[model samples]
Target: SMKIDVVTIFPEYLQPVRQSLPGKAIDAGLVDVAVHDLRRWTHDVHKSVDDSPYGGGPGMVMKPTVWGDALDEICTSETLLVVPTPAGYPFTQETAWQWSTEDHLVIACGRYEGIDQRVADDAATRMRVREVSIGDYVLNGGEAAALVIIEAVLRLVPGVLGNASLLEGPSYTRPPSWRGMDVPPVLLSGDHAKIAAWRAEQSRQRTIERRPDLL
Candidate 1:
């Protein structure tokens, strides 16, 4: 089973996972998820983890020492450390698939300006380090992105979403007629082959319109 350890200041932000599908995955022995407090490694009275940016930025940069201590005790040679940031790698389905294959993942949740550059640089010398961003936007912190990453990766784990159909294109529900629109008649025609062909074309067209990069 894969193990994911998230180190963050707000450990409670990760509690929802324990009450959701990720929790079920853990219960079934499909994966292991744990949250750690980064402040546990702080040495000062206030447990400070950040300081003024070296180059003088608008926000505080996370201190390297605290992160260094936390990761040193958590990472192994097999561990993959994922640092979330707007300037990092684009987090896509492909990225999720790649991470799902790893035996261990350590996600570092950075607040304020972000963790010091040296944190990732130093860690790269030992374990696999990936700096990833969920999209083209910025957030208050990395907790939300971590949650998104966790769910996407866990869903691909064997038996986590058992017997789930991956071939879905577009779907409709009962009372398909809403706002003067309706689901395609082909969906209700009961002609299985015809419906599949229509859905395949729709999927292709939608992909080209929204995410041509996938092609």
Candidate 2:
């Protein structure tokens, strides 16, 4: 079973996952999900995980020392470390598939201006580290993005979804609708072979229309 550990300041934010699709996966032992409180590693009384930037920045940057120790203690070589940032690589269906194959995934959710760059650098050298962005816009923290990625990827794991074909073809698995049109008539024809072809075409059209840059 694949294991996913999310390190965040607010573990409660992830509580909803226990009621979501990932929760089902966890109950069935298909996957294991854990949310860790990053502050638990802080040695200071204030539990300070952030401070003024050394080079004089506007906002605080997450303290590298806190994160470094926390990660070092929890992560292993088998872990795939993921950092969600606006500047990171775009999160996509393909990325989800790649992550699902891992035995363990460690997601770091940063707050304030973001985590210390050195923490990310160190994690990269020790494991498969990926800086991912769920979308073009910015979020206050990485927890929501991590949740998005985990759910999307978990759905692809074997036995997680009732129909594996749901991922085999389309906008996400097949083609896009034409000129604001809906799925082709073939899909409604109930003819398996014809429906398959229509799905492929619709997926292609959808990709071309919405994300032509990917074509």
Candidate 3:
């Protein structure tokens, strides 16, 4: 089973996963998901995790000490590391899908201006590390982005979706007619081969139009 551990400052924000499909995956013993509070590693009185950026930036950068300490306790050399940040490469389904083959995934969620680069450099010295971004946008923190990463990977675990067909391409429902449009007749023709072909084409076309870069 795949194991994912999310280390973040906002564990409360991660509560939804325990009530969703990811939760179901855990309930079925297909995967293990845990959330840890970064503050727990801070030894300071205020549990301060950030400070003014050394380069004189407008926002604070997460101190490497806190991350180093937290990761030291949570991740071992065998753990695959995932860091979510605006400075990372665009995240993709391919990476998430393949992560299901791994035994453990450790995600470090950064907040404030960003994490201190040296932390990532330091982490690479011990384990494999990957940096990822949800898209070309910024968010208040990496918690939400980490959640997205976790769910995508969790769904790929075998049996998590129950029927394999649930992972198939776009699907339709009854009363497919809405507004002025109607469901494709091919879907209702009862010709199994034709329906599969039509759905395959729909998936390809949809990706091409909205995410041509994926091609």
Best by lDDT: 1
Off by over 4 Å in 3: 21-28, 161-171, 176-182, 191-209, 212-215
lDDT for 196 (candidate 2): 76
Cα lDDT of model 2 by residue, 1-215, tens digit: 78888999989999887456444556788887788999999989999989998889598899999999999988999888999998798999899998878889899999738898999899888888998899988888998998899888878889664436122344332444656777655656779997777777767777767777766
Pick out the ten consecutive residues of candidate 2 with the lowest summed lDDT.
165-174
Better of 1 and 3 by lDDT: 1
**Predictions in order: lDDT:** 0.88, 0.83, 0.84
Q: How much is 174 displaced in model 1, in angstroms?
A: 2.3
Full ranking by lDDT: 1, 3, 2
Clashing pairs in 3: none
- For model 2, the superposed segments whose C-alpha errors exceed 4 Å read 21-24, 161-209
